[PDB]
Paper text:
In the PT-based defense system Ssp, SspABCD confers a single-stranded PT modification of host DNA in the 5′-CPSCA-3′ motif and SspE impedes phage propagation. Notably, SspABCD coupled with SspE confers resistance to a wide array of phages through unusual mechanisms: (1) SspE is a dual-function protein that exerts both N-terminal NTPase and C-terminal DNA nicking nuclease activities to defend against phage infection, and (2) NTPase activity, including GTPase, CTPase, and UTPase activity, is stimulated exclusively by 5′-CPSCA-3′-containing DNA in vitro. Here, structural and biochemical analyses reveal that SspE is preferentially recruited to PT sites mediated by the joint action of its N-terminal domain (NTD) hydrophobic cavity and C-terminal domain (CTD) DNA binding region. PT recognition enlarges the GTP-binding pocket, thereby increasing GTP hydrolysis activity, which subsequently triggers a conformational switch of SspE from a closed to an open state.
However, the side chains of the C-terminal half, including residues 327-771, could not be resolved due to the mediocre resolution of the X-ray diffraction. The crystal structure had four molecules in the asymmetric unit of SspECTD. Each molecule exhibited an α-helical fold with only a handful of β-sheets.
Residue numbers in the entry:
A (entry chain B): 334 to 799
B (entry chain D): 333 to 353, 356 to 801
C (entry chain A): 331 to 801
D (entry chain C): 333 to 800
């Protein structure tokens, strides 16, 4: 098997310490850690793939990167940018520290080992807050590896920082950073058909350039080797405002200038087919602390804080109680308005999606709305007794026992709401539903990015396309 | 048809004062409480739930310690309702308080069948990891007495103005929950029975015999009438008061220094007394540990975040972290008979590990010689090393190599035991218990403001709790 | 893994690293302090020099942390080192101050005691002001005497001066360091001047570090207690405590220093061949004695205190000045003509303080083995105020010396003890040198006395037990 | 046969006071014998003449601040003039003579000690002879700054006359404060000006002063206008310090140096080594003291740990062999070197081009290409002689001296280590940056001696002014 660009770099990291002779040299503790992470992968492709992917994100993190997957190209760069630190002792030290930090992060925070939780090595478990846990989980699910580079940067700084006040400040900044990255990615991705090359945006941020804000590079060092000015990993506005603008500024390639355009873009796409993880993240954002709408029978509205909370790491992980389920079946089925199957994409838009217990699926699948209405009313009941009363009160006999479905019952307003809807369901209604949902989601993620799009609404609004 | 609860008897009474005036919003607080009770089936469940709601209510409004009997419950409600016959806003905040205790018991303490835990009116942020872990633990322990003080801090967090005020009171709620939990853990770990902890909490609520300058924790005074406001504080008041109740010679907590805590806890069959308590202690102990390079089979604190388990997740993780006995619970071969001199030996902290529950089929009643390989394997960094270890050994276990390797996880305390070359005796488990109880103490210490002297015997009475 | 033994320090390094599971290590405090110690050892070549340097660093370390005389043997050092690090397993800050202490002793040995090849002496972390004239003179002398035992107590005061807050705190501890250095030095000089061999001074210092038979109320001087565990604090204090403890050890009937009054000091010192025992000690005594002296108007061969600053030699400069102030014997070391045979009855006579002068070293070629009659002119000349009078004196004499008149005049300098001897008309005998020694030892005592807080009885005769160090 | 010095002419004039009868006078005799003592040191002829007239000159500055000429008849007078001022009082013609004793004492022991003796302050303990005092005396003497004698005698005289214990010590510490202030003032004035710029004139004013910028009056013992209504004394701690501080640094003053920018600009520009090698040396020692090689600007230095590399000391001053002033760009046009350096004949002599290096090595450094000088500095500045060997051998070069030999002269010297690390070629621009760094560090070190605090405001308020 071919030697990875990593093992080719170790001799180079040994000719470069004179002689500790190492190990006792520092590199050999940072470098041992990285080895620790790679040892996790079996010789052959897994070891190859893991190493080249570690190096790729490394390049983005030390300089805006875009280092290719090909091996000879990686053997360089490692060479290139170590020679940059031939002279200084402490600077070929911080560099290697940086490589340790990216392996630390990928291995523990991004893709933890088989049974372990997620962690930020060197940072306490307090740092591993609920929001941090939910974003890591989501970004990973989306396979958004590009987000690793900016994240390592804030992690690296949190570790290196002095204990007490310094560490905490940088830890809180890490959360601010993770939120901003996530919200930006969600908004960009919800509002576009494909990936629309988000990656290209992130690299530009890392490297700097095309900076909508006054802000400079996010990588550790400058791509142009030499120094006249410092480089700062700051997120309080810097990441936030820069990303905010990249999405929402006419000068930016994010084609989303106001609320009405966001709603129009997202409403229109088959989000479930594009990215089930994204659909799920949006649904959780939307349904969190909602209550059935007293005036619009199908709909929901924001309610008491903590009354129906799902927008959490636990909620993300909870496939068992909160599975994505289609209201209008994915396929033409009787008991349903044919309008829904004009466009193959209709059934997959946010408005048609609910979160329901996964087991019930056997009873919900391909049934007329008449049947589903009872099921949602039941599955959304406050006690299993009410579910029992609802299910029996109905004439229907479902695929599962009354006793069984009642067990799966839980307080879920969006389900209760749909159960109360007396009027028939059509694509027009799902569009209204999507609007309601996308608004609530926006209201929840908005703060993460510092967004405040015009809800001038038509008046002083230009419904713009990307 | 069946006999009416002391709750329904109270609603007429809440209406003759409403008092029309569906017309009254007080109905809204009262409607909410009804919401919670409707959850219980007519008969025993409805009766039990209502009388338990009222009991904690009494402690929270007053230190009353209201009995289980029904006629005695009809009485309180009228007793302490009339107290608020005159003022409009004061029979309002009172009812608000009853709403808050039902809100709390129903959502925070014992949530509905498939829902998470919540603090109604407080955001999901308030539902922090530590808050979630303590609620989970206290519930598991069935420590219902902790509800009364907790409602009090909840109630205040709700009632507080948005923004700065709410957050301050929310942070205080966490401080409070930690202090209550640490206090309960320390008290309970260090005593044979329940040692009447309850009596301590009620005293705090009232609270009699306050070691610190601090006054009652309930909403109102048990002696009906007012000259001064009622304290409801924690940042020292609850913390220091509880700290002292455990650790002060004047207090009934018989634990004056570290050496005595270690001596008391080391000696008890904690697993038999309270498996929940054993588990909470083990999680505290093992959190961010690394195998000891000098004392084989022992552990020491390590890098922050390297092996964290002291979390809500860890508490809930029965699948990866099950309590397992090192020396089998019963006399079995491959094991020193020393362990079965005292039927309590096997159940002391030092003999307990956290391991994946599935493996149990392979660990059960096996000689140490084997358990050593199993722990070494189950605690491995990769499943490849687990394979390497299991195969390397001669043994064939109840489960396939492939299977056990799958259960591998990085767990230093297991790695540590796998490296131990010397035979295991009760002397070693006692050393183990010492190490563990110290780490636990180090972790819970901050929750209570504790700082017991460890003089390493330096000027140290090793003191027993006093009959 | 090459050749000869691995030093205790290297063995210890692995242990110092295991003790830091959580953090760093590089970030670790230890591998900053420990890098510094490495700095000092790197100075020595592989083999004996590296071995010797390391084991000696560890020895003084032991005395300084716990007043324990750690042996030279390696296995004993590997162990001594582990023992007392495990004492600080638990606390972060306490295995930190401990390592700081090891840094401080290497800092001190390397810069203050035996500086690098061309560098001055320094107290790392302390300003150059701290490097006062007296500090410089004592370090120079103690080093010359090879009094390595003094390193342990000295590190202790240094360590505290560094660790102290800037401004008032640092200065107070720096001034205490000088007080300390004086006391150590004066005590060592008095003990050693008054005894035949080393009389085991070392044993005294170790007792102080540990002490342990403390004549004063004073407790240990080491950082920590040899008996591992703590109930009470330990002080490195110098002025309230140190002078007094040392003072008593020399001068108290309960103490092993056998020197209870002035008359016994004078009797003990007068009698020993100090120059043979320790030329450095003789030199330090002579400088103390001759400092600010003037020829005695009433006794021809002798000297008395004079105006402040008139003829100062008791200084770092004076100590270093081998060129102008070399120890020279008045009666030649061997039987030579022109000299009374009395001087060679006892082989030790010629080497007692009274027979020693400080003179320019070059002149030696002209002074060597010459009759007194000549040496008299030479001293009179070499001690002259101007080189003109020196020429006046040398020419005025009939003699032709080994060096030209012009040459010797060039070395002429104002030196009363030389002027005084040149005026002595009466012949020189051992009786006269004894009187000389008395005068000298008194002046020395008067100068060093303050350093130690001493005030010995000169009452006697009226009341003088002239006591011997034995019995 | 040669003319009688104004001193011997003054003894007849002195005895009349006692006059013929007493001691006689015993006190005066003791004082005279002491001054006579000092003069006896000089050979009859020119040396005796010169020494006596110079003793009298500084005496005049110290007693009346009068700038007495070198000519003899003018000296026989003033002596006469100012003794008749004390015809009446016994104790006042006593303190006067005491003052003359003190100036001879000072010149003879503190300023120019006898052939092999150390420096001393007669009547003051050896403690008084502190390191800073020793370094300043040594420097001022080297600079030939005889004008500084007058103010210094004044503080000495007062330290002697003062009661033992508290009084003496206070006046002794004041003598150090005084010596620092005089020295710093002289260094700053002289570093910043082309010629001597008549510093002397400044000092005289202070003694008689006279044109005071501060409220302070004369520094001499007595008033030049003979008669008394008020006492004359100056504490330096405010007075000498503040007065001198202002004379250098005040728009009203003839010192044309109002801020840091102007100081740096003035000093950077002058061929200091050619103007005054002693001054260059004093500045270099100030600058290099406790420095460490700059991690960002190679070849540059920055302040470091206290006591890591101390050279600003009496020992350092005297240490010619270890710390000799050496030019980086050779004094003359040589190959291996940028011709830029020889545009202006003065360039090579500016502070930035000067290092302190062991004097013996000179045989290996002289007129060599930089490429070599770089290795040599790196080697000579090494921490151990092993590293010096490592460096010298590691280089291809063979120098005038053996590797073994040069390694021996090795000493820890950051400014040398720093230059050894410099990869970029050397030009006049670099030496200017170097001079800036050095002059700043020197300023930071001497600043406290004078109570100075010049605006480093310049980017905010640069100015900056020239002198005159």
């Amino acid at each position: 098997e071919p030697l990875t660009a990593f093992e080719t770099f170790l001799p180079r990291v040994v000719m470069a310490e004179k002689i500790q002779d190492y190990q006792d040299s520092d590199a050999h503790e940072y470098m041992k850690a990285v080895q620790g992470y790679l040892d996790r992968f079996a010789v052959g492709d897994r070891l190859q793939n893991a190493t080249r992917d570690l190096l790729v994100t490394f390049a983005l993190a030390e300089t805006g990167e875009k280092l290719s997957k090909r091996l000879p190209d990686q053997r360089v760069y490692m060479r290139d940018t170590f020679e940059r630190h031939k002279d200084s002792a402490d600077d070929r030290s911080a560099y290697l520290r940086h490589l340790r930090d990216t392996a630390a992060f990928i291995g523990n925070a991004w893709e933890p080992a088989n049974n372990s939780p997620r962690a930020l090595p060197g940072l306490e478990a307090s740092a591993m807050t609920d929001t941090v846990k939910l974003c890591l989980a989501f970004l990973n699910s989306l396979k958004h590896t590009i987000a690793i580079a900016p994240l390592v940067r804030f992690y690296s700084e949190a570790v290196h920082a002095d204990e007490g006040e310094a560490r905490e400040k940088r830890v809180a900044e890490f959360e601010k950073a993770i939120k901003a990255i996530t919200a930006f990615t969600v908004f960009w991705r919800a509002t576009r058909r494909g990936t629309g090359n988000i990656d290209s945006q992130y690299r530009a941020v890392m490297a700097g350039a095309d900076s909508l804000t006054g802000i400079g590079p996010l990588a550790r060092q400058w791509a142009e080797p030499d120094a006249t000015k410092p480089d700062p990993d700051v997120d309080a506005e810097a990441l936030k405002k820069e990303l905010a603008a990249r999405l929402s500024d006419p000068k930016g390639k994010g084609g989303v200038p106001n609320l009405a355009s966001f709603l129009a873009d997202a409403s229109a796409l088959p989000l479930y087919k594009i990215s089930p993880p994204l659909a799920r993240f949006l649904l959780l954002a939307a349904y969190h602390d909602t209550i059935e709408d007293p005036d619009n029978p199908g709909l929901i509205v924001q309610g008491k804080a903590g009354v129906a909370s799902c927008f959490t790491a636990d909620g993300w992980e909870d496939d068992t109680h909160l599975t994505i389920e289609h209201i209008a079946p994915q396929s033409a089925t009787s008991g349903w308005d044919a309008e829904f199957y004009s466009d193959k994409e209709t059934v997959h838009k946010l408005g048609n999606l609910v979160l329901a217990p996964g087991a019930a699926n056997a009873s919900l699948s391909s049934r007329p709305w008449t049947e589903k209405k009872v099921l949602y009313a039941a599955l959304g009941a406050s006690t299993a007794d009410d579910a029992k009363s609802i299910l029996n009160s109905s004439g229907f006999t479902f695929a599962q026992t009354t006793e069984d479905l009642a067990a799966m019952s839980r307080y879920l307003p969006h389900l209760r709401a749909l159960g109360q809807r007396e009027d028939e369901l059509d694509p027009a209604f799902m569009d209204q539903r999507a609007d309601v949902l996308l608004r609530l989601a926006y209201t929840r993620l908005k703060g993460w990015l510092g967004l405040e799009l015009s809800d001038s609404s038509s008046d002083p609004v230009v419904k713009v396309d990307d």
